[PDB]
Ligand SMILES: [Zn+2]
Ligand SMILES: [Zn+2]
Ligand SMILES: [Zn+2]
């Protein structure tokens with residue numbers, strides 16, 4: 067079948083190849099893939115930032131139809147719509163997996179990175195680890211919630227935001243557009259959206275953002291303070307790949323505020339220690355979400371509380387999409403369509 | 406009334422002056438001070454690092470006997486031993502005061518910075534804010550618990566360490582000493598102490614620390630990973646001022662571990678984003694704590710689970726102490742003794 071894979075010399079791009087899948091194991095399932103979104107993490111994978119993965123099928127925003135199941139499978143049946151996510155399989159038994167924190171499993175398998183992901187006509191999944199897409203959720207939309215959605219939904223839970231609090235999102239990209247949507251429609255936060263791209267801000271404003279701020283036109287930190295009463299926001303979710311966004315996020319928090327890093331720029335950030343010490347502010351990383359996080363995240367999509375902004379593309383287009391993402395030209399997600 | 410005050414041109418030193426206090430309002434009390442510890446913060450206020458505070462009485466590690474009470478005061482009576490701490494008074498009604506996080510009050514008054522403190526024979530206090538010192542606690546130890554004590558105690562609370570978890574303390578002297586005592590003796594953590602000074606390490610070993618690591622001689626992060634079974638510690642308290650100590654703390658955290666800074670880095674701290682995200686770590690810091698945190702911190706002192714290193718000096722020696730502290734010659738606290746008898 068046709069698959070997008072990491073190059074023999076990783077350079078940031080995909081090779082399109084014919085691949086034959088091995089036979090399924092007894093707790094596994096075989097999918098006819100329907101859709102796979104392109105996430106910034108695929109690009110980091112393809113670029114070799116996390117080591118050489120030449121030949122690995124990319125993609126961890128996959129939606130597919132179950133074509134075949136192993137003998138031991140009781141959780142899925144043929145014809146089930148399931149997902150292929152960054153969190154592909156955990157060991158099930160470690161302190162992380164057992165305490166509700168399965169993404170941090172040290173023996174984790176990650177789709178499109180340490181195991182063939184979903185950007186191919188067909189994929190193998192471990193059955194009990196492939197979350198069903200609920201009935202009333204459009205498959206193209208489900209593709210975005212599979213990474214972009216569960217990621218930001220979980221990071222907003224990690225931020226400690228309660229309804230009525232001010233929350234700032236740095237980045238209105240595929241990730242940050244959804245973060246906005248969850249923040250406003252699910253968690254009841256008041257939302258500020260910060261980006262360099264006016265067209266993305268404009269869209270932000272239509273899907274939830276209470277206030278938009280272009281950070282090439284003003285100092286976001288100053289403006290954020292003005293908006294909030296002079297203190298700053300309760301939380302900041304960083305969905306921007308720029309160093310400065312992380313640092314502007316920290317300085318924009320009111321005392322006891324929480325910064326949650328979601329974006330993976332290959333970058334260090336400066337940490338204002340006097341800010342954590344005197345103003346009691348917290349900094350934390352959040353990593354996709356558990357199987358339960360994703361189910362909850364799908365369910366809000368199915369209910370229409372979030373509506374991922376999506377456009378379909380052809381597999382042969384993966385490299386055009388990669389350059390488009392690098393150029394910041396993308397609203398929402400581009401989704402590879404295998405139908 | 407003899408008082409130590411910020412000089413007219415703040416120069417890092419104190420003037421010793423005669424001061425006559427105003428009358429006390431109805432919700433306040435007047436104290437006869439027994440003890441006031443000399444803190445690194447007093448040296449910063451005196452230097453003008455925080456703005457020009459000329460004439461302000463210094464000191465936020467005070468312990469004193471209530472001498473007089475305002476007409477509205479029910480919480481204290483003449484003869485009570487109470488404290489004069491960094492957190493001197495909050496507004497009582499803002500989001501921070503009422504949610505249980507009063508230290509962050511935007512109208513906070515701090516002893517020895519924005520209000521006269523406890524480094525004088527006498528102090529005014531707002532009676533409801535002067536936490537009582539429990540009867541089994543040595544008053545001189547109490548002076549130090551009001552700052553270093555509550556600080557390290559509340560930091561360990563925000564770390565989330567639970568009994569049986571590994572915690573690493575970076576920097577074995579100063580704050581670290583008290584931090585090691587709370588973590589082992591109060592919270593039931595397994596404790597690693599990291600420092601460059603073997604003397605300090607051997608002492609810390611004496612007061613509970615399970616593993617000591619000379620960071621002068623080996624990479625701490627590597628030994629810590631080995632100690633803990635490969636992953637790292639659940640949390641790290643940073644009590645050292647060297648930047649490398651912060652970088653090692655974060656790098657030594659198991660996933661979802663939390664670093665709590667109690668000191669400030671000499672050069673800006675950096676974090677690696679991809680690691681923060683893939684390992685889900687957390688970095689915070691803590692300074693002093695609420696009146697309740699202070700009460701609990703005092704109480705563990707009174708049960709004899711923590712014991713700060715303290716020594717007494719005369720008010721007259723205040724500038725000598727400041728010189729000792731810049732020369733880095735003081736283990737624990739020098740505490741100004743006002744008492745007779
Ligand atoms: Zn992703
Ligand atoms: Zn596991
Ligand atoms: Zn102090």
Ligand SMILES: [Zn+2]
Nearest residue numbers: 496499502510
């Ligand atoms: Zn207040």
